[PDB]
Design an enzyme around this catalytic site. Structure first.
Site, PDB file in Angstrom:
ATOM      1  N   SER A 179      89.120  11.237 -13.986  1.00  0.00           N
ATOM      2  CA  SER A 179      88.300  11.167 -12.774  1.00  0.00           C
ATOM      3  C   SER A 179      88.361  12.479 -11.986  1.00  0.00           C
ATOM      4  O   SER A 179      88.022  13.527 -12.510  1.00  0.00           O
ATOM      5  CB  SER A 179      88.889  10.023 -11.932  1.00  0.00           C
ATOM      6  N   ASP A 203      80.495   2.927 -16.397  1.00  0.00           N
ATOM      7  CA  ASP A 203      80.990   3.857 -15.389  1.00  0.00           C
ATOM      8  C   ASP A 203      79.798   4.571 -14.769  1.00  0.00           C
ATOM      9  O   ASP A 203      78.969   5.129 -15.480  1.00  0.00           O
ATOM     10  CB  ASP A 203      81.912   4.875 -16.058  1.00  0.00           C
ATOM     11  N   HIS A 260      85.222   2.765 -15.433  1.00  0.00           N
ATOM     12  CA  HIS A 260      85.850   3.975 -14.944  1.00  0.00           C
ATOM     13  C   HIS A 260      87.293   3.616 -14.595  1.00  0.00           C
ATOM     14  O   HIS A 260      87.572   2.495 -14.174  1.00  0.00           O
ATOM     15  CB  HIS A 260      85.133   4.465 -13.698  1.00  0.00           C
TER      16      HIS A 260
END
Length: 308
Positions: free
Chosen positions: A153, A250, A280
């Site tokens: 991320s 995601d 995600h």
């Protein structure tokens, strides 16, 4: 037995039984997690120390996996968390897998978080941490030619930016970049399809994403700042080869794909694979979800092959 729990138990029961007869409270507290029960792969050595940087000191937790001979290949890792949350503990399980399965020494960097430290604090920490670690390659018996950067991320964004800064600054050499569902940015004018497609119901939402940005960024113009949205950087050529993992559900799925495209068009070797049934931040479900578990190990094995 409750199915979900049974799955977690299977993962715990297959690992080596602890030698409770010679286990310290410190070892138990760091090697075992019960809240919630998340598997922590055993590593040969775990060291934590400070990196005295200009204006600030960052803690770093280093994981040396069992069965690896020096000079060791390494991974400077930046945890995800929207540039607002996460630390050395939240991603401890993830780093242990990357070290264990990646067959590399992992250095988890505890970079400064927003809003207390707004952009580009994390970016300078990411690069500086890489430089601090690489210049001390010998201290850790690392192979300087096999030092990679990576993160999940926000961390994947940091690893991507760091690679570019490293290029502009002439070093240190980066052998690979492991980007786990990274927020590599995009032209706000033309948002990828996954943005709206997965904007709700899958953990990372449109609201949360934008909240992270309010905390991290200073001005609206920074939405296209290359150190925030590296996919916009003019010349991506010469960057370290890369592996990008995206999650089908995601919102940033296509964002990762977008960076893969830019890297390839720029002549950079890049492998990208989408995990069809994950969301995600799936790495956080290691040992809790069979799919997340297998996915992360595969990712770790991609790192292994690249630094082999």
């Amino acid at each position: 037995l409750d199915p979900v729990i049974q799955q977690v138990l299977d993962q715990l029961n297959r690992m080596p039984a602890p030698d409770y007869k010679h286990l310290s409270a410190q070892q138990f507290r760091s090697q075992q997690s019960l809240f919630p029960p998340v598997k922590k792969e055993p590593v040969a050595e775990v060291r934590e120390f400070d990196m005295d940087l200009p204006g600030r000191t960052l803690k770093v937790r280093m994981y040396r996996p069992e069965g690896v001979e020096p000079p060791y290949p390494a991974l400077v890792y930046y945890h995800g968390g929207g540039w607002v949350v996460g630390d050395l503990e939240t991603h401890d399980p993830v780093c242990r897998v990357l070290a264990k399965d990646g067959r590399a020494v992992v250095f988890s960097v505890d970079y400064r978080l927003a809003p207390e430290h707004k952009f580009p604090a994390a970016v300078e920490d990411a690069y500086d941490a890489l430089q601090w670690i690489a210049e001390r390659a010998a201290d850790f018996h690392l192979d300087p030619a096999r030092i990679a950067v990576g993160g999940d991320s926000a961390g994947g964004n940091l690893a991507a930016v760091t690679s570019i800064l490293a290029k502009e600054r002439g070093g240190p050499a980066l052998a690979f970049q492991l980007l786990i569902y990274p927020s590599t940015g995009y032209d706000p004018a033309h948002p990828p399809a996954s943005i709206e497609e997965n904007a709700e119901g899958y953990l990372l939402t449109g609201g949360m994403s934008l909240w992270f940005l309010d905390q991290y960024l200073n001005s609206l113009e920074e939405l296209t700042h290359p150190w925030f949205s590296p996919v916009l950087y003019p010349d991506l050529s010469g960057l370290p080869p890369a592996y990008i993992a995206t999650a089908q559900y995601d919102p940033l799925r296509d964002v990762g794909k977008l960076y893969a495209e830019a890297l390839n068009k720029a002549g950079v070797k890049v492998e990208i694979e989408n995990f069809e049934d994950l969301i995600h931040g799936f790495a956080q479900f290691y040992s809790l979800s069979p799919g997340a578990t297998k996915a992360l190990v595969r990712i770790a094995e991609k790192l292994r092959d690249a630094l082999a």
